[PDB]
Amino acid sequence: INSGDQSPYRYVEERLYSKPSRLDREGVKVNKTYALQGLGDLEPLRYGANFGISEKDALKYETVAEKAKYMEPPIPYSSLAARKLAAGALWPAAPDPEGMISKEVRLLRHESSMSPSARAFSERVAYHLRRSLKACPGHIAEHIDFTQLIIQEVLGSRRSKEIYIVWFTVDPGARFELEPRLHQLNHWVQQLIIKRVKRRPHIPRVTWIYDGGRLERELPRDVKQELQSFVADAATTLESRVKYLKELDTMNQRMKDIP
Amino acid sequence: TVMGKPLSLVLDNKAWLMEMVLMPFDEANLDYRDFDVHIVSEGHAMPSIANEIAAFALRMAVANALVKLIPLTRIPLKKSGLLSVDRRR
């Protein structure tokens, strides 16, 4: 495939799974985006002929409820469906387990790199986790060796969709005794969050990060911005910003010109 | 012998250069002592050719000569890439 100003992965994603791609495949004249031709048995079964349901027909319904009301059942089986069944491609192969190992991430989010709301929620979560960690369900408590566990902090995302509990052990040899038991608690932790902290942007997904002092933090937001302003190329930045202003004023003139 | 002088003297007794000249024999499962060779240079003459590009050219020449002497040697040599020509200037 030919990729221009975009990655080949994203290019194929757009040309396979997309509104204009699907419309062109169903046979609707669109120009800017095109579907991939002649994929044999490789095109998604959703868009194979004699399967799924026609989007050219589905354009006729203005609402999802109306589509549900008036849209006839899909054809259960097809030739491409038989090929997918023969190849075993009716359900993707299971990837390696990620719910029983820690996140070996690149950086470690800085205390100044998170919104104040996320920061607030984080210290509350850390307080309650440290207070209640011994009152975990008995069938996990009986095997967790609390003598070794340590939790440095909890970081989480902006608006706390995700929480990252940074933990390690006194002796490094205990990480592989402690990790699975710790990952068996990610539901108990969510219930603790629901029960104890009342100002939560929303109940998050819990993820454990092992950092025995090995990982390295990020730079402060202000220091990073100062470094960027200090070393950035002034000529290119000025030209780009002037072009941006030119485009903004052009759009404003178009808006004012349309009566 | 390269241009009337022993290889150890032409390539200035450099192990990493003469082993390329040896490579076509080893890849072919052959004994270098069963064959005696002479390499003549038609390129830009220089006082010393003790460099990797010259060694590459010598290895390619030896490999081609071996191929034409005994055709069945062309199997391991092409697979090893001694018959392939680099295009870099």
Binding site: E104, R106, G212, R214, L215, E216, L219, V231, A232, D233 | -
Partner: protein, 132 residues
């Protein structure tokens, strides 16, 4: 003189950090060969023992880093087209990170090394003590 960032920092280690270019020669090797021959024929082994001590102290196998521990410690992706800024940062970073501070190199009496002899006694210079 004009102050610069070429400070040698002689305080630490046997070699001044950001060390000056050091170039060896075959004449140096010949002089070393003659010096070693004369020392071996005169029986002086104190300098050999000191050389082995330095080799043992500074020639251990570096510890395999643990995941997450990376080599630059600084993004180095922000100096976009600022090659001189990147070069100054690299000079200063490698000047700060000194061999005395090279934690990942096991060095000191706390280390055990079955590869090299530690006590100058168990060397072939002392071979009549080994004969029961």
């Amino acid at each position: 003189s004009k102050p610069s960032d070429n400070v040698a920092w002689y305080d630490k280690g046997p070699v001044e950090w950001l060390p000056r270019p050091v170039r060896l020669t075959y004449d140096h090797l010949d002089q070393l060969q003659q010096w070693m021959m004369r020392a071996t024929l005169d029986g002086r082994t104190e300098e050999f023992n000191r050389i082995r001590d330095l080799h043992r102290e500074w020639s251990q196998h570096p510890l395999m880093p643990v995941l997450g521990d990376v080599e630059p410690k600084f993004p180095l992706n922000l100096f976009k087209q600022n090659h001189r800024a990147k070069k100054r940062f690299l000079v200063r970073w490698h000047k700060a990170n000194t061999p005395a501070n090279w934690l990942w190199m096991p060095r000191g009496p706390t280390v055990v090394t079955p590869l090299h002899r530690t006590n100058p006694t168990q060397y072939p210079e002392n071979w009549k003590q080994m004969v029961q």
